[PDB]
Structure 1
């Protein structure tokens, strides 16, 4: 089990490394690398502006590194900004995303922003329904086909979680979501088997 976490940013990505190392404890023969070039079974795309990071994945020849993962039925999981990058474009006016899942990113309909605090995620399947820690302004827009988890903020229901095959996206911070985030991350690992 080779786990790779793309470390190039932006944001703090080490809270995620720690959360993943934490969840991988009970698991046999497990390795976790910080990633910024070609070598994984479970690849993490973290981050906390759509422009930056989309730039940093270019400036590190990783767009293909990720493309090759998806192509090879490997697990590819976007966290926070990383999730928004799975899509075609965000409102970063003009920048193309990874276009791994069809859709775009859009400002939240709320007068109160950012969406910040613990909000409920309800999953179609597999993952633990419950409260996770959110901090974001932009949301994904996609087909119900690719909706995995749902969350309501200020009367607006959106994809707090997303899935196209073995590509996964989570809009919240599992590494800051207490017991349930750990359980969520465990289930992500358990899936890549």
Structure 2
């Protein structure tokens, strides 16, 4: 197994790179690569990290030739994982940047949250439908996914508002929180992602 992580997008991504690195310490067939350009190919697990403006990142996969390289990972029945902004991509559009088409790998768009205390920041409970462990993870995000109760994988509530912290469309997972900033359970989450990816 080789895991690849898109190293281009906005915000800090080396925090995810370790922690995924940390999580695969228990696996033998495992190797982790920073993916800089579409050249290398292909990975079993591909991570889409990032934090920032929806437009940026759409702009950075884009000039670095990674939209097509992602398009082909999802196709060839490989695990593609978008984390934080990486989850907010994947969909059609954000109101954080009107116009830009996103990745559109899951049907839905992106809206601001409806709370007057933003961003959503801190430890919040996440309830999973299945597979991944339940409990508190760590959040920093001002935008939210809109998808159909089918691609929803995990739900969280901030200031009255329920919303999906995890998504799953087959072999595409998305996670809004930072698993790399969630102490013990966050490694367990990332370990279970890896365990899901050996089954293809």
Query: For 1:38 and 1:52, how far apart are their aligned partners in 2?
Result: 18
How many residue pairs get aligned? The number is: 193
For residues 114-133 of structure 1, what are the structure 2 equivalents within 5 Å?
Answer: 114-133=119-138
Poorly superposed stretches of 4+, deviation over 3 Å: none
Query: What does the per-residue CA deviation read over 1:28-80, in whole Å, with 9 as the maximum and x for residues that have no partner?
Result: 12111100223500000000100100000010110010000000000000000
Q: Residue 82 of structure 2 contacts residue 175 of structure 2 at CA under 8 Å; is this kept in 1?
A: yes
Query: What does the per-residue CA deviation read over 1:87-143, in whole Å, with 9 as the maximum and x for residues that have no partner?
Result: 000031111110000000000000000000001110000000100000000000000
Query: For 2:177 and 2:138, how far apart are their aligned partners in 1?
Result: 6
| Structure 2: tracts of 5 or more residues without a match | none
Query: For 1:81 and 1:156, how far apart are their aligned partners in 2?
Result: 20
Q: Residue 92 of structure 2 contacts residue 104 of structure 2 at CA under 8 Å; is this kept in 1?
A: yes
Query: For 2:179 and 2:18, how far apart are their aligned partners in 1?
Result: 11
Normalising by structure 1, we get a TM-score of: 0.99
Question: Residue 9 of structure 1: CA displacement?
Answer: 2.0
Q: Residue 38 of structure 2 contacts residue 64 of structure 2 at CA under 8 Å; is this kept in 1?
A: no
**In the alignment, is residue 60 of structure 1 matched against residue 64 of structure 2?**
yes
| Structure 1: tracts of 5 or more residues without a match | none
Query: For 1:6 and 1:58, how far apart are their aligned partners in 2?
Result: 12
